[PDB]
C-alpha cells in the first residue's frame, strides 16, 4: 500500500520545502502506510525533454497525481500542456496550482486536468456581480479573438442572458494586432459607455493607448479590467479610474501547494477506503491501457471539499475549476493600485475607500446614456 505523488515545480528550494510539506502531511494520525511519496522535477524549457523526463521518472514511479506550478519565468507562458497530455493519456489526474489560462476548462482536450485557481473566464461571474450592484444595465465587451477570450465571452453571455439582457455589440481583436483604432472609433458611437476588457497585456496596452489618443477615457466611461490586463506594461499605460480585479494570493505558490497536498492526500485516502483499486502501470513504455481507477480518482477529486486550506474552502466543479474563490476589486488611484472591494462569491462588499472614475470625476457616473442623435 504505497502511493506516490509527482511534482513539477519551478525552483529547487520550492521543491525541497514542498517535499517537507508532504512529509508533514504524512505526519497525520489517520495515515499509516506510505501514502505520499515526494518526487520533484524542474521545469525543463524543452517540451519533449520535459515529456521524456515525466515518462521516465513519474509514471515509472507509480504516481497517482502530478502537481504542476507556475513556471519560474512569468514573462513566458510555458504552459503545462506537455505534462497534462501525458497524464491524460493514462487518465492520470493532475492538480494545476497557479495555471490561470482558460484552455484547460474543456476536458475534451485535457482529459484529466484539474486546477485550484479559477481561470480568466471565471471573472465573468465577478463582472456580472459588479454589474448587478452598480446597475450596469448596458455593457460593451472588448475581447480578443482567442480561445480564452471566446470562453470568457461565452460565459459572460450565458450569465447575462439570465436577466433577459444582452450587450449592444461584441468586438474581436487579433492576438497581436496594432491598428485597433477602427474598432474603438465604431464603439464610440454607442449608447453604452461601460467597457469590459479581456485581452493580453500587449493588447490591453494598445487598447489603452488607442482610448487615450481618441479621448475615450473621459468622464462617464467605466473600464472593467481583468487581472492579466493590469499586470506588466499596462501599469505604464492604464489611465486613472481603472476598475481592475486581482486574485487574493493568486500567485502564491506556497499556499496553493499546501492546500493541494492535503486535498490530494484526503482524496487518496477516500479512494483507497472506497473499494478495490487498480495500480498504475509500472512503465510508460509499451503500455496502451488507461488507468481503470483514473475516472474514479477524478470523481472523488470533484466531490472533495475541505475548508482546512489556508486559502479558504477548496472545491472543484464539473469543469475542474475552483468554486467560491476570493477576488479583490482594485481601483487605480494616482497610477497606484488601491484595494477598494472584495468578492467572497456572489457578493461584492465595497470598502471605505472612495472609488474614483476616469476623467477625474469622484461621484459615481451613470452607465447607458443617450445622444439625441438618432440615425
Amino acid at each position, epitope marked *: 500500500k504505497i502511493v506516490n505523488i509527482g511534482a513539477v515545480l519551478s525552483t529547487r528550494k520550492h521543491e525541497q520545502m514542498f517535499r*517537507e510539506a508532504v512529509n508533514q502531511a504524512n*505526519k*497525520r494520525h489517520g495515515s*499509516w502506510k506510505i501514502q505520499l511519496n515526494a518526487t520533484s522535477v524542474t521545469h525543463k524549457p524543452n517540451a519533449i525533454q520535459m515529456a521524456l523526463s515525466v515518462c521516465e521518472d513519474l509514471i515509472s514511479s507509480q504516481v497517482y497525481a502530478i502537481l504542476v506550478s507556475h513556471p519560474p519565468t512569468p514573462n513566458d507562458h510555458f504552459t503545462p500542456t506537455p505534462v497534462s497530455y501525458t497524464a491524460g493519456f493514462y487518465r492520470i489526474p493532475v492538480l494545476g496550482l497557479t495555471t490561470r489560462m482558460s484552455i484547460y476548462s474543456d476536458k475534451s482536450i485535457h482529459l484529466s486536468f484539474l486546477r485550484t485557481v479559477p481561470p480568466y473566464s471565471h471573472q465573468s461571474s465577478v463582472w456580472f456581480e459588479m454589474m448587478r450592484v452598480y446597475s450596469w444595465n448596458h455593457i460593451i465587451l472588448l475581447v480578443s479573438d482567442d480561445h480564452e477570450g471566446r470562453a470568457a465571452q461565452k460565459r459572460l453571455e450565458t450569465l447575462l442572458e439570465e436577466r433577459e439582457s444582452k450587450a449592444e455589440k461584441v468586438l474581436q481583436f487579433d492576438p497581436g494586432t496594432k491598428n485597433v483604432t477602427a474598432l474603438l472609433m465604431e464603439a464610440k458611437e454607442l449608447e453604452a459607455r461601460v467597457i469590459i476588457l479581456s485581452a493580453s497585456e500587449d493588447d490591453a496596452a494598445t487598447v489603452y493607448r488607442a482610448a487615450a489618443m481618441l479621448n475615450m477615457t473621459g468622464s462617464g466611461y467605466v473600464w472593467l479590467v481583468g487581472e492579466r490586463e493590469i499586470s506588466g506594461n499596462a501599469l505604464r499605460y492604464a489611465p486613472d479610474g481603472i476598475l481592475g480585479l486581482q486574485l487574493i494570493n493568486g500567485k502564491n505558490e506556497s499556499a496553493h501547494i499546501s492546500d493541494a497536498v492535503g486535498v490530494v492526500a484526503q482524496a487518496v485516502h477516500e479512494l483507497l477506503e472506497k473499494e478495490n483499486i487498480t495500480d498504475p502501470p509500472r512503465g510508460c513504455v509499451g503500455n496502451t491501457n488507461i488507468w481503470k481507477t483514473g475516472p474514479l480518482f477524478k470523481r472523488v477529486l470533484m466531490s472533495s471539499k475541505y475548508a482546512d486550506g489556508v486559502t479558504g474552502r477548496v472545491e472543484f466543479n464539473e469543469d475542474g475549476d475552483r468554486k467560491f474563490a476570493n477576488y479583490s476589486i482594485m481601483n487605480l488611484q494616482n497610477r497606484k493600485l488601491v484595494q477598494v472591494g472584495i468578492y467572497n462569491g456572489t457578493h461584492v462588499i465595497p470598502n471605505d475607500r472612495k472609488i474614483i472614475w476616469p476623467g477625474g470625476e469622484t461621484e459615481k457616473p451613470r452607465g447607458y446614456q443617450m445622444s439625441t442623435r438618432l440615425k
Partner: antibody
Amino acid sequence: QVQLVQSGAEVRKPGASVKVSCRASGYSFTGYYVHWVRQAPGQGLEWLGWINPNTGGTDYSQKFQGRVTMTRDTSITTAYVELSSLISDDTAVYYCARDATGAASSPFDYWGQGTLVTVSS
Amino acid sequence: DIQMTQSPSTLSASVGDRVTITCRASQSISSWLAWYQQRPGQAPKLLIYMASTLQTGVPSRFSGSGSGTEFTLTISSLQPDDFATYYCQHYKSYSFGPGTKVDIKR
C-alpha cells in the same frame, strides 16, 4: 540546552475555556513538531493533537474536534493550545513534547514539566 | 484506529527481579512502537524508540523485542527508580496503552 516551559496550574468552571502555553528554547522551534498529550489521574496518556510551527498545519483528534485550537508564534517560539467546553473528565495534566520533522523514529524525545488544569464547580 | 493493550495490568516484584511487559496492538504496525517511563508527579521519559534501539542515556538494563502486533519490554534488574508506569505507543496512531505500573511487592 533543550528546555520546555509551560504555564502554571489553572482552575476553570465547566463549560469555560482554558489556554495553555509552551515555550521552546535551545533548538529550532519551526523545525520540530509540538505535540499535546493529556493524562487524567488514574488513567494513561491521552493524545490530543500536534502543531507544525514551520507551516502552521494543525491536526486534531476526531474525539476532540471542534474544541481544540492550536496557535504558534515564530517570533517568540511559543505554542498555545485552547480548549473549550470543559467537563469534569477534562481534569488532567497537559504536556508538550518535541518531535523531529520528516523523521518518524524519534517520538517525544523531550517532555515539559506539564500543566495541571482542574475543572470543578 | 489502533488500540494498545498492555499485560499485566499491575506487576509487583522485588528489587533486582526481572520485569516483563507484554503489549499487543489491534493490527500489524511493523516495528513502529515506543516505550515510555513516567514516574508519578513527573513527566514521561522515552526509553526505547522503534522498539529495537535504546534512546541515548537510557540504562542498558532495559531491552525491547517483538515485531508485528506483539512487543515485549524486558528489564534485566529492577531498580528503585524504575518503579514507574510503562506505556507502549504506536507512531502513526499516537495511541497510548492502559499502562503497566511496577510496585514494591508487599
